[PDB]
């Protein structure tokens, strides 16, 4: 329910030009309701998100390339 409400808020922000300020709405975990996190002071550096996205995508691609595993028995 919370994710559905958050998605509805963000979709309304993206589709309605005069409701663009709704894109700051995040999750308020203490009360379990959507909250404007920009006004609430919940901030993160942009570099964290960008680097996380890039690194996770590259790791996922690296694992996804594998389709065959050969596991040699140890020489010991």
């Amino acid at each position: 329910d919370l994710v559905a409400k958050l998605r509805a808020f963000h979709n309304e922000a993206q589709v309605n030009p005069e409701r663009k300020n709704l894109k700051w709405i995040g999750l308020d975990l203490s009360n379990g309701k959507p909250r404007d996190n920009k006004q609430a002071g919940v901030f993160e550096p942009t570099i964290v998100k960008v680097k996380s996205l890039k690194f996770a995508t590259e790791a996922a691609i690296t694992i996804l390339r594998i389709d065959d595993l050969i596991k040699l028995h140890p020489e010991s």
């Binding site: 690296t62 390339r65 594998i66 389709d67 065959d68 595993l69 596991k71 040699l72 020489e75 010991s76």
Partner: protein, 52 residues
Amino acid sequence: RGKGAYQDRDKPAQIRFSNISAAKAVADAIRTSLGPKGMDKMIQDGKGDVTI
């Protein structure tokens, strides 16, 4: 004429067949990783080293 050399030894034929089977098995194993739509192989060494 008719019959030729009997070829009493079948071992050379068995050796040839085994060699061909081994080569064909290797080719079949590495066929999957050919072309733009091929996929990589994970190989883990006996020492635990991993290569993709």
